Amino acid sequence: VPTVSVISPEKLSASTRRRHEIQVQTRLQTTLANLHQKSSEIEILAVDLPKETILQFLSLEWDADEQAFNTTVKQLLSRLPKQRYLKLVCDEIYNIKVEKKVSVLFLYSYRDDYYRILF
Amino acid sequence: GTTVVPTVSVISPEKLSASTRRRHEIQVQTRLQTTLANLHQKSSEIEILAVDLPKETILQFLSLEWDADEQAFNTTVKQLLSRLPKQRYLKLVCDEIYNIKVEKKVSVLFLYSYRDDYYRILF
């Protein structure tokens, strides 16, 4: 059970605050449990894409099932100009994050000298 | 314990000469050295931060830079806040992220929308 805190736009009652705390702890139980099925390896994926696109790739969901991954790929690809290259980038992310389960993937644009970490 | 050579894959829109591929590999392996080194500076703690923001805003927060300066963090905060409607709440959320990720050096932070039931991990 990790440290948790709630920060809300308006004042919260003690009971609303504890319900959110329990709600989120519960919804994350499975994910947290799975956290240890990951290998401690670090990989880098170097791509020719602008910073803004690297950011879009962070919406990919690689910590659920295959359907969730595929859905987020479909959504990502539908919101960007059609390009086979984007799909190939997603495939490699799938291989690295899902198949090989690597905990720390640096997604780095060699064009823009910009990275984000897919954990 | 000084220079780390992480595995690297170059994926290019068009065929890459062995020499171009090499150049890109050295570029990214070099540029990431500092980052990779400070990777053992992080504590093994996991933390959750629950917020009332939609998925789209959660995703925007992933642009914050917490692995360098307080300066680099504050710069990404200003950019983030400048592209969303003015709201004290946003800065308050940013402040807690700073404390968790930079001050306490927490490695795994779940940023969780209790409105949309949507999280992303800030590592």
From Swiss-Prot, chain B:
It is found in: Cytoplasm. Disruption phenotype: Mice are viable, fertile, and exhibit no phenotypic abnormalities under standard growth conditions. Show an increase in prenatal and neonatal mortalities when essential amino acids are absent in the maternal diet during gestation. In response to nutrient deprivation, display reduced abilities to chronically down-regulate hepatic protein synthesis, resulting in preservation of liver mass relative to body size and enhanced skeletal muscle loss. Expressed in liver. Expressed predominantly in the hippocampal CA1 region and the dentate gyrus, and to a lesser degree in CA3 (at protein level). Expressed in liver, lung, brain, kidney, skeletal muscle and testis. Expressed weakly in heart and spleen. Expressed in the hippocampal CA1 and CA3 regions, the dentate gyrus and cerebellum. Isoform 1 is widely expressed. Isoform 1 is expressed in brain, liver, skeletal muscle and testis. Isoform 3 is expressed in lung, brain, testis, prostate and choroid plexus. Isoform 4 is expressed in muscle, lung, kidney, brain, testis and prostate. Signal peptide: none annotated. It comes from the Eukaryota. Belongs to the protein kinase superfamily. Ser/Thr protein kinase family. GCN2 subfamily. Metabolic-stress sensing protein kinase that phosphorylates the alpha subunit of eukaryotic translation initiation factor 2 (EIF2S1/eIF-2-alpha) in response to low amino acid availability. Plays a role as an activator of the integrated stress response (ISR) required for adaptation to amino acid starvation. (Microbial infection) Plays a role in the antiviral response against alphavirus infection; impairs early viral mRNA translation of the incoming genomic virus RNA, thus preventing alphavirus replication. The histidyl-tRNA synthetase-like region and protein kinase domains are necessary for eIF-2-alpha kinase activity and eIF-2-alpha-mediated translational control. The histidyl-tRNA synthetase-like domain is necessary for binding to uncharged tRNAs. Kinase domain 1 is a degenerate kinase domain. Homodimer; homodimerization is important for kinase activation by uncharged tRNAs. Interacts with GCN1; this interaction stimulates EIF2AK4/GCN2 kinase activity and is impaired by IMPACT upon a variety of stress conditions, such as amino acid depletion, UV-C irradiation, proteasome inhibitor treatment and glucose deprivation. Interacts with DNAJC3; this interaction inhibits EIF2AK4/GCN2 kinase activity during endoplasmic reticulum (ER), hypothermic and amino acid-starving stress conditions. Interacts with MAP3K20; activates EIF2AK4/GCN2 kinase activity in response to moderate ribotoxic stress. This is eIF-2-alpha kinase GCN2. It comes from Mus musculus (Mouse). The chain holds residues 1526 to 1648 of 1648 of the full protein.
